[PDB]
Amino acid sequence: KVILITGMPGSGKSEFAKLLKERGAKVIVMSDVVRKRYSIEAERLMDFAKRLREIYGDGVVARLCVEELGTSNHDLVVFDGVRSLAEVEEFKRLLGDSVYIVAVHSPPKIRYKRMIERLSKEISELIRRDREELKLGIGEVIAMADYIITNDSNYEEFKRRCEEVTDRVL
Amino acid sequence: IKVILITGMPGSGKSEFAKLLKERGAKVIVMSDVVRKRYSIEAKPGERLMDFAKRLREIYGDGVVARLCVEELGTSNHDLVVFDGVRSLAEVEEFKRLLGDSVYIVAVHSPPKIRYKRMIEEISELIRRDREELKLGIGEVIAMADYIITNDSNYEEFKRRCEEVTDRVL
Numbered sequence A: 001k002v003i004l005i006t007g008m009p010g011s012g013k014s015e016f017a018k019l020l021k022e023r024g025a026k027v028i029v030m031s032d033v034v035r036k037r038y039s040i041e042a043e044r045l046m047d048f049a050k051r052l053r054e055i056y057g058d059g060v061v062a063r064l065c066v067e068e069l070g071t072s073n074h075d076l077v078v079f080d081g082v083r084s085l086a087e088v089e090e091f092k093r094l095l096g097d098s099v100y101i102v103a104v105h106s107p108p109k110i111r112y113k114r115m116i117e118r119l120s121k122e123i124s125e126l127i128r129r130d131r132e133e134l135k136l137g138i139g140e141v142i143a144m145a146d147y148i149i150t151n152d153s154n155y156e157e158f159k160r161r162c163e164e165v166t167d168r169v170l
Numbered sequence B: 001i002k003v004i005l006i007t008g009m010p011g012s013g014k015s016e017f018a019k020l021l022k023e024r025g026a027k028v029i030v031m032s033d034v035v036r037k038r039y040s041i042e043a044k045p046g047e048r049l050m051d052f053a054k055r056l057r058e059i060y061g062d063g064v065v066a067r068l069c070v071e072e073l074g075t076s077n078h079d080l081v082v083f084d085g086v087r088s089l090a091e092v093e094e095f096k097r098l099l100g101d102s103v104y105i106v107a108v109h110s111p112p113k114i115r116y117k118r119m120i121e122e123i124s125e126l127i128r129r130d131r132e133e134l135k136l137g138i139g140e141v142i143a144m145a146d147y148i149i150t151n152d153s154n155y156e157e158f159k160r161r162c163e164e165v166t167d168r169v170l
Ligand SMILES: Nc1ncnc2c1ncn2[C@@H]1O[C@H](COP(=O)(O)O)[C@@H](O)[C@H]1O
Pocket: B010, B031, B032, B035, B049, B050, B051, B053, B065, B066, B084, B085, B086, B087, B088, B091
């Protein structure tokens, strides 16, 4: 049983990842995986990830994350940060038929405000960055999701929504 | 005037949200109906609808259907309007350029297997049609939505979810 978590920047998707860590799931952050490769073979992080997808194909990060998983039994595996259907397709080829996409949604202005409130923050730059993420294919993953969780109110409503999706998946 | 843009994948029940608004008294313009009107004056004999839709975008740019839908509205109309079936962010931007900044995107979500299950009661064809809709840019509209309504249980819960969103918009 595998959960692929996707969401736009500032959606709070890692909060869903955190809730799954607490329930005993193996959680693998896809960017942590690319970063391990980066320290070895880097050059900004986005630049190195681009080179990987050109050399090895669009599903590369999924292959890398499966390597990181290794050969072990887990009740629940979670991959936090899926960006394309090419990745989803590699997770399915490698891990089988019990793979689910969960998107965490927040409208653009809410996400922008969360990011601007962090401890560039120009609105034009946050807009350009959504657009780069969309060009990688994240909108296609969201549109084809098994579950979409809205994070547009408080933490406690979000946590309840996360819990009920988890129950449906399990 | 308030502008409600409805987006969703084939078999998602986006038309049911449109229906509900229509039933409340809203002016609902169906984007594919506007395409069919153009079809009767510009299409090649026997041309597939999706093929014609792609050719209009080649000739007039990615925002055409929105422009056509605004011309359908008329300059003389200043009431709330609903456009059923937005396919891309280029359409959204055209609606904003022409009708201003009270523009709301509501996505109706259903997961792939559920939507396919509804339509069948040819699978590779359906998957193919989904791929064409994604290439038009529908996933980016969903990813950037103000509200995502999930239709994955029964009609009544879906209706209550639609009512809540429409209350927030009004
Ligand atoms: N913005 C648009 N909205 C809806 N339909 C469109 C648009 N542009 C082209 N079309 C054509 O209309 C078909 C049916 O639309 P719908 O009735 O919403 O499923 C689509 O698959 C397209 O081929």
